[PDB]
């Protein structure tokens, strides 16, 4: 698909250079309306121009435009662009037949996108869930817009636990040097480690013992811990599979021997400060510092994230690094990255490092999402109940209409984890977010349930009409698209602003405004099928007498972006009702 912005970006561009040909670089300014009054996009170069008048110049722009095919009309009100509708109608004929993607660019960027990130044998709680579910999306908005995309899960598996957690193993199971034991639930198997912890004295000496051991390197000490890890991989597994989440695995364990280099750097270029033998560091416009070795000689989270960035500036080469991570982490992010920034590992104009925040998520009172009480709701505990209530709704009363293989599973996994992934992404990320299975649930309004239906029903009107795969993609070669109609052109117009709303994304990193296009696009399609007749039929027989084959295909352009916003967002479709 084009993108229009950069379309009349160019057509601009053209008519000021042909205007005004000693400005070689002149501000191209186009943005969609501002409606309120008539325009489709303005182009506010006019202002740009008279400082490096307005009205004058603006006019003179506006009479050098040069021969063009997707500007109707133009007013000065700023520059008012109206769109031409055998343009719209063309590029309708075009993303069916050849499909919908965004315009390439000359390179593929290496981006890495930072999420997920539970630690190991630890409760992984809905802080957890938000970034896995922004990290995805983000992660599929890159790749369908051609970057090369490294989706790293750096999960927490190094930390103090391990101690324990290898010494409980080491009673429970003796012999796992030699056969693989049956651990089994892993969160039992922590808090088990952690009550003897608690309650006796030689096990508390043994599980420091265990991480010296651990940080050496002893082979059946490591072999523990791999084992340990092995089981956690299962069970995250279980987990991404379920939100259809894709992520490279790379720990806290893989920066380990990088951490003595960064703190010899750190003090070889004078940024180290002694305090109660810690070294700390003082990062520029941030009062409080980066502590990177405590007292007893121990590294620090601020030393392992130090370590990463510079791995994945250095060894990666990454032209972009996202950081989706809860907004009580931004002053440590933001502080990182203005260490890396000091020490010169990357300059911020030519590398894009990013912190992707997102609030707190809130119970329907509006204070903090808690079980009853006080410990941490888990993920297996959301994603099951809504499993549940999904179900329940089915059973009123898909019961023999649908096989089980396409209820049972099919539906019921559309809409929960559908409905949990939209609700979340349909609010701006940085705002506190209230979970609520009503709400999210609710068959109307601007909810998964609702725009399933709405896709499956979309879907449908070709279908029920008896017309064919094929019928259709012979129809989009050989058929005008007409776009008469009020809401024929409300709707041409609204399915090309897919790529613009993408491009703005690939910016700011706010998914909201696509389920907000794609709402919009669900609303314009339902005025336009509520006022535009695509099957005509005898009042009293009810007879098919004509099928209006262009309207057949305004339903399949809108299916055809509408699946495209899905996949961004991870909502997976179910048409068997």
């Not at 429970?172 to 040097?177: A, R």
């Not at 013992?209 to 069970?235: F, H, M, Y």
């Not at 893989?254 to 810690?278: A, C, H, L, P, T």
């Not at 977010?433 to 070709?462: E, H, Q, V």
Request: hydrophobic share 40%.
């Amino acid at each position: 698909m084009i993108n229009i912005i950069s379309r009349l970006q160019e057509v601009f561009g053209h008519a000021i250079k042909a205007a005004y040909p000693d400005l070689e670089n002149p501000p191209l300014l186009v943005t969609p309306s501002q409606q309120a009054k008539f325009g489709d996009y303005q182009c506010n170069s006019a202002m740009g121009i008279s400082q490096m008048n307005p009205r004058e110049i603006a006019e003179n722009i506006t009479k050098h435009l040069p021969d063009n095919e997707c500007i109707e009309k133009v007013e000065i009100a700023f520059i008012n662009v109206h769109l031409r509708k055998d343009f719209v109608s063309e590029q309708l004929t075009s993303l069916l037949v050849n499909g919908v993607q965004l315009p390439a660019l000359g390179e593929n960027k290496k981006v890495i996108v930072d999420f997920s990130s539970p630690n190991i044998a630890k409760e992984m709680h809905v802080g957890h869930l938000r970034s896995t579910i922004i990290g995805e999306s983000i992660s599929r908005l890159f790749e369908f817009a051609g970057y090369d995309v490294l989706r790293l899960n750096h999960v927490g598996d190094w930390g103090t636990q391990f101690g324990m957690l290898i010494a409980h193993l080491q009673d429970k199971f003796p012999d796992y040097l030699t056969v693989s034991p049956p651990i089994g639930d892993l969160q039992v198997f922590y808090k088990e480690s952690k009550k003897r912890f608690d309650t006796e004295e030689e096990f508390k000496k043994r599980a420091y013992q265990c991480v010296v051991l651990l940080q050496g390197k002893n082979p059946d000490i490591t072999k523990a811990w791999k084992l340990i890890c092995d089981v956690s991989r299962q069970e995250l597994n279980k987990i991404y599979d379920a939100l259809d989440v894709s992520l490279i695995e790379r720990g806290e364990s893989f920066y380990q021997d990088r951490m003595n280099d960064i703190v010899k750097e750190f003090e070889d270029r004078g940024f180290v400060q002694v305090d109660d033998g810690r070294k700390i560091v003082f990062v520029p416009g941030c009062s409080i510092p980066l502590t990177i070795v405590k007292s007893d000689g121990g590294y620090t989270y601020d030393t392992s994230d130090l370590a990463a960035i510079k791995q994945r500036l250095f060894e990666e080469k990454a032209d972009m690094i996202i950081y989706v991570v809860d907004n009580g982490q931004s002053v440590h992010f933001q502080t990182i990255f203005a260490a890396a920034q000091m020490i010169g590992w990357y300059d911020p104009k030519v590398t894009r490092v990013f912190h992707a925040g997102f609030g707190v998520v809130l119970g329907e009172d509006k204070k903090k999402f808690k079980t009853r009480s006080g410990e941490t709701v888990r993920l297996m505990d959301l994603l099951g109940e809504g499993l549940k209530r999904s179900m329940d709704k089915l059973k009123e009363k898909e019961r023999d209409k649908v096989l089980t293989a396409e209820e049972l599973n099919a539906a019921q996994t559309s809409v929960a984890y559908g409905c949990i992934k939209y609700a979340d992404l349909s609010h701006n990320r940085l705002n506190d977010y209230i979970f609520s299975f009503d709400k999210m649930l609710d068959d109307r309004g601007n909810t998964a349930a609702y725009l399933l239906y709405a896709f499956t029903r979309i879907r449908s009107i070709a279908r029920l009409a008896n017309i064919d795969e094929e019928m259709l993609q012979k129809a989009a070669r050989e058929t005008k698209i007409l776009l008469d109609h009020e809401k024929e052109w409300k709707l041409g117009r609204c399915i090309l602003r897919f790529p613009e709303i993408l491009q703005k994304i690939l910016d700011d990193l706010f998914l909201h405004t696509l389920c907000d296009y794609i709402y919009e696009l669900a609303t314009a399609f339902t005025e336009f099928y509520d006022s535009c007749y695509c099957v005509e039929k005898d009042r009293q027989t009810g007879k098919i007498l004509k099928v209006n084959m262009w309207r057949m295909l305004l339903c399949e352009a809108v299916a055809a972006v509408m699946a495209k916003g899905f996949d961004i967002l991870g909502i997976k479709p179910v048409q068997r009702m």
